[PDB]
Amino acid sequence: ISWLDIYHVVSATVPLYVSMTLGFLSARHLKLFSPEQCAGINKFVAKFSIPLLSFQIISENNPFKMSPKLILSDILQKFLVVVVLAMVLRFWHGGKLGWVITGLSISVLPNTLILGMPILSAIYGDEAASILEQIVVLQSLIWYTILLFLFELNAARAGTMKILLKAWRKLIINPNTYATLIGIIWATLHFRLGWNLPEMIDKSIHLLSDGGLGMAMFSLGLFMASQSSIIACGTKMAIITMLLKFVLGPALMIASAYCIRLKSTLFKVAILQAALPQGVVPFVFAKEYNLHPEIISTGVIFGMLIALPTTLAYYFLLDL
Amino acid sequence: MGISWLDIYHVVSATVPLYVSMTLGFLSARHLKLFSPEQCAGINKFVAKFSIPLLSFQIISENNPFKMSPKLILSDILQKFLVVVVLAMVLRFWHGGKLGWVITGLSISVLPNTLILGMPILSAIYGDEAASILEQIVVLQSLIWYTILLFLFELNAARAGTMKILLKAWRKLIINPNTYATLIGIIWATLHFRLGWNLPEMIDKSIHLLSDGGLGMAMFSLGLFMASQSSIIACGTKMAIITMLLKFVLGPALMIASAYCIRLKSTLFKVAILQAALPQGVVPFVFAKEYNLHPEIISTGVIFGMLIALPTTLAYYFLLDL
Ligand SMILES: CCCCC/C=C/C/C=C\CCCCCCCC(=O)O[C@H](COC(=O)CCCCCCC/C=C/C/C=C/CCCCC)COP(=O)([O-])OCC[N+](C)(C)C
Ligand SMILES: CCCCC/C=C\C/C=C/CCCCCCCC(=O)OC[C@H](COP(=O)([O-])OCC[N+](C)(C)C)OC(=O)CCCCCCC/C=C/C/C=C\CCCCC
Ligand SMILES: O=C(O)COc1ccc(Cl)cc1
């Protein structure tokens, strides 16, 4: 609400768009980076910046003060989206497991690590910062882990003991699997035994992680410069990729946030963290398994350009 | 002894973080084999185009032009003039392309790392009064010397009458992001500190996002480059010693000569000589890697320069008072 409060959001999103536009312009118009060089800037951002940035969000989580209702509310949204994606597909209006993972990656996996903290913190202050760290840990540890094992069922089933090992061979090498497993072994050791990182270790991690939230958008602009067409695939798959992340997604967190009885800041922060642009980690899997890679990208390169117009719509709605 | 055990630790505390970033790059291109040689250029092309230019703007814009000591600007300029005279004179005799060697001579001799390794060290050996003397020397590097150096990198690459070459070298200098970063940086520092204008929070945050991890990428890029060399001493044991007799002997020695000529006072004299003996920076390498002007000699100095930086820096500290 208000008119100045609307400025605290535009002022917190523009910095994330100036970096995004300085990447797209540096790959299409300026012709500064060659296509193969653009894959090196993204690889460094996907293996050294994001994993190190997830260590500073997961480490400061206080696992001993994690709400049992919010955790049981995210577990309910995903289960209430499966029952919606496992029923709509039934009527289709077959290889349906292929079309489900594409629906569980476009709707219930928002970008909280990069866009969740800056945009939403500027909306609700520092009282909505710990409510998103609780999500980053769950998405990094469970949802991204329950999706990677759910992707492996399409590269094989098209038994099960040969799937978990085949999925565990891709987790033991994934950089984000060690930050999410060491960032929770340190948080449990720093908030209980009071073990604080030495200055050398702490600063050694900031040198790379500090420029990771602005670099994650520069790489995204570079990717948005790779896709020649702004909206790939027919428009019948571009309005269903935007009505599936900003309507069905949040409208099923409103059903789980009123059944688990979430109230107060914990409520208005959980329904707004869902109405955020789709994350790109799910797209990383898509290409790696060729599961509609061009249907998720359109949800990202177009889910980002409608990030501010729609965030203000749900922030206003949550204010009655 | 004046130096305290907490000061030696602070010296290491400001150096190890750079090695961690550098080591990750090294192991990320030699053992794990992640980045191809072309991709390694992309990371270096981003540092020289988006990070370094933005760091230059922040350094220059946050300094007060109307409070830079005139004596320290003359001493800094005089040191560079003497060094180029020695480098130009020595190269002529022997006490190929000689302009490339002069750039590599000033890039490892008169461009210390006074921003990230100078402040933690000199602020530990001297009080905060010495943290302001190094701010006018870090601003000078971004404004004058780096801008001049980027012209010599173009006046060199454009040579492979002289008026046409200079025009071509200039024509590529204006398009450089660094030139506009410094030009805008100084134009802002004048307005902010003389009129009281404040940079909008949207233009200050936006710059921070694309510049905060610039140091990490620079060290990371250096590790990537060293992942391709056959040995850590990529220039040989002979040119790896001459890269030290320049930075830690010929650098400060000529700085002392300039300080005497300008007649610097007590605190200003000491802080202006130790800063010249500081370990070599990475910006001279970032430009030497992109223009392919002997990046091997510059890089090996950066690595071993930091190791030998503590023994030499203390030596100068004990060598000035008594
Ligand atoms: C005072 C000592 C002086 C300092 C020395 C210490 C330096 C370490 C500090 C910072 C650097 C940390 C390493 C980052 C490596 C880059 C990312 C990377 O490399 O990803 C991972 C490893 O890392 C990570 O996942 C991120 C880890 C970051 C957090 C953990 C490290 C920091 C230490 C914290 C202390 C906590 C202790 C708790 C107990 C833990 C018990 C297990 C390696 O896979 P990959 O990404 O290379 O490629 C893999 C893909 N493919 C197969 C294609 C090549
Ligand atoms: C007298 C000279 C003529 C002046 C003409 C008049 C106005 C010019 C406009 C000035 C405003 C800033 C211009 C920024 C563009 C830099 C110049 C440029 O076109 O090049 C783009 C540069 C990469 O150059 P390139 O050679 O590598 O590729 C370009 C060459 N080719 C196409 C062949 C590959 O990339 C980038 O600009 C992005 C990365 C660099 C970012 C540096 C930002 C520095 C800070 C600026 C101020 C910021 C905010 C405002 C300050 C507060 C005031 C409200
Ligand atoms: O984790 C997310 O969803 C957003 O973080 C990223 C942004 C860009 C790339 Cl290239 C990879 C990850």
From Swiss-Prot, chain A:
Gene: PIN8
Cytoplasmic side: 27-37, 90-99, 226-241, 287-297
Record annotation: effect of changing Q273A: Enhanced auxin (IAA) transport activity
Tissue specificity: Expressed in veins of mature leaves. Strongly expressed in pollen.
SS bond list: none
Residues in compartment: Extracellular: 1-5, 59-68, 121-130, 202-204, 263-265, 319-320
Entries under InterPro entries matching the protein: Auxin_eff_plant (IPR014024), Auxin_Efflux_Carrier (IPR051107), Mem_transp_PIN-like (IPR004776)
Transmembrane feature ranges: 6-26, 38-58, 69-89, 100-120, 131-151, 181-201, 205-225, 242-262, 266-286, 298-318
Native organism: Arabidopsis thaliana (Mouse-ear cress)
GO molecular function: auxin efflux transmembrane transporter activity; identical protein binding; protein homodimerization activity
Protein name: Auxin efflux carrier component 8
